Amino acid sequence: MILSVLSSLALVSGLMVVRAKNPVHSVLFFILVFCDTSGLLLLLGLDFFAMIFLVVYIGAIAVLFLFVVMMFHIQIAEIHEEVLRYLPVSGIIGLIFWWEMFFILDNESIPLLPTQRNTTSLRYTVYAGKVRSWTNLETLGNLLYTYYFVWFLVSSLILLVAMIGAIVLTMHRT
């Protein structure tokens, strides 16, 4: 039920991202999709990722988009178009993608139907793994910098490329 609520909010917010006449409004509805995603992540028990989606996607990336799109002052005439003529092609593509892709896990991951019986007493509890609990933060930090550090450093190289490109493409020194 809660997943239904979050799914509906994300669906409507994403439709608003792709269908808002004003791009600034599209960026603000994108922030709502990211907040909804963060709620989903909190339901998964991954609090670090839920907070990092707020810090990075909303706090940094969406701010970048908002800053740029606001200073553009885009007039509706340059980007407007009637989208009624795209109902059939979008209908076909969306229906094909829907049937093939919303049920891709059904054959591999067959759902457990909820019986009218308390199957929650069949929960076996192991206290050995509960003596010292690791947070999602510590579990990630145990791996990032030692056993998979090459990928970490390559990501740093990617960021350096971003900085250099931003300067070489836009800088006009005074």
Residues 6+ apart with CB under 8 A from 83: 19
Start-to-end CA span in the chain (Å) = 57
Query: Is 83 strand, coil or helix?
Result: coil
Q: What's the rounded Cα separation, in Å, for the pair 30 and 14? A: 7
Q: How far is the CB of 141 from another protein (least distance, A)?
A: 3
CA distances in angstroms from 97 to 13, 18, 101, listed in the order given: 20, 18, 5
Q: How far is the CB of 125 from another protein (least distance, A)?
A: 5
Q: How far is the CB of 92 from another protein (least distance, A)?
A: 10
- Which amino acid, one-letter code, is at 69? V
Q: How far is the CB of 120 from another protein (least distance, A)?
A: 8
